Amino acid sequence: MLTKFETKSARVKGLSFHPKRPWILTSLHNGVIQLWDYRMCTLIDKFDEHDGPVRGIDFHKQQPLFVSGGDDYKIKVWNYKLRRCLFTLLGHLDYIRTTFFHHEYPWILSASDDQTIRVWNWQSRTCVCVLTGHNHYVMCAQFHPSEDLVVSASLDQTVRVWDISGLRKKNLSPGAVESDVRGITGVDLFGTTDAVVKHVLEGHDRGVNWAAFHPTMPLIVSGADDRQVKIWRMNESKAWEVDTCRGHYNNVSCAVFHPRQELILSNSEDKSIRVWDMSKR
């Protein structure tokens, strides 16, 4: 109905909308992190996290705080509200894409764009988890259905899905029948970002811009570094699923699922946003 406010500027790699607020917190690769609590058409703060670019934005999970990543390689959580830094560690050799907050003993998970992501105890000091299975440059890192199960999208042309543990990664199982992750007609490839057969999914599509998950589900909706943004369901795994998402002119940087909407929104580069179904598609 109305586009309340609109100025075109910002060169934007990472993004998030406030699930609680009508904020948008926006990550530019201008090196900028911004929180604007978008409501009153006003920015609360604006820090260009470092000289270098900024790729990442993720939620802490609480109410109004950012966990942020730059080419600093640092995980910062700073509360806009409390304008202060919660606990601090820098980052490996690339930026931080996703974060989750937990609390047996007020306990923490950090998801990263490089190498490993490490999950840390500052209370009764022990190890909840270690994640290796990333390399460099994560476009879109994701919590899964199980929130603390996860997927990652890479500029290392892989995807990682990991299994975690309370004493590092492992799963025990023995009942299933076939798999959709990989087990009948169609299915898409493994990539390499880690080295355990959970599934490293192939992020080659000239590299993957975005990865997006299906909560209980393993369908992914993707942005890809190909015109082809190729959709695959690992809750099916169709053939002509070797779908290349097509503009008219080039690209499909991203195409995304809206939690509520059984739809795909695509956006591209001929000057465009392209409109897609996904209810009958």
Place this chain on the structure above:
Amino acid sequence: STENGIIFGNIVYDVSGAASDRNCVVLSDIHIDIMDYIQPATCTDAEFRQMWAEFEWENKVTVNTNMTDLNDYLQHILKSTNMKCLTPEKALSGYCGFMAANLYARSIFGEDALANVSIEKPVHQGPDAAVTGHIRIRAKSQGMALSLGDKINLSQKKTSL
């Protein structure tokens, strides 16, 4: 004191959710208007005219329409804004008049605002139960100035806010 230039106020304000509270009210104000602020203020007419013309021309709003004669109506408006009409000529605000009324006021943070409004005026089958008089508003910024013309426009009549 405290300059904040967020005009007409309407500036976001916070009551916070910070303790037995998960939310609260963040509010921007509205309800902050002019008609009140300015006080009446005065001038020599020749100089005035000269000045009238001279001033920040840039705003005007029209008077036309009401519920009253500009006797009672004018008085009401005057009191409402707390502002001045500088001088009469007896020509007659009665039989018609076919009077243009010059008004001046000075405020609390000191802007002087000038008006010439020229107005028809009530009287049987003669003229005035509208106006179609033009209210010429001069205040330095047009933005407040016109806004003032409005504000007065709000002021002008009496109806469901």
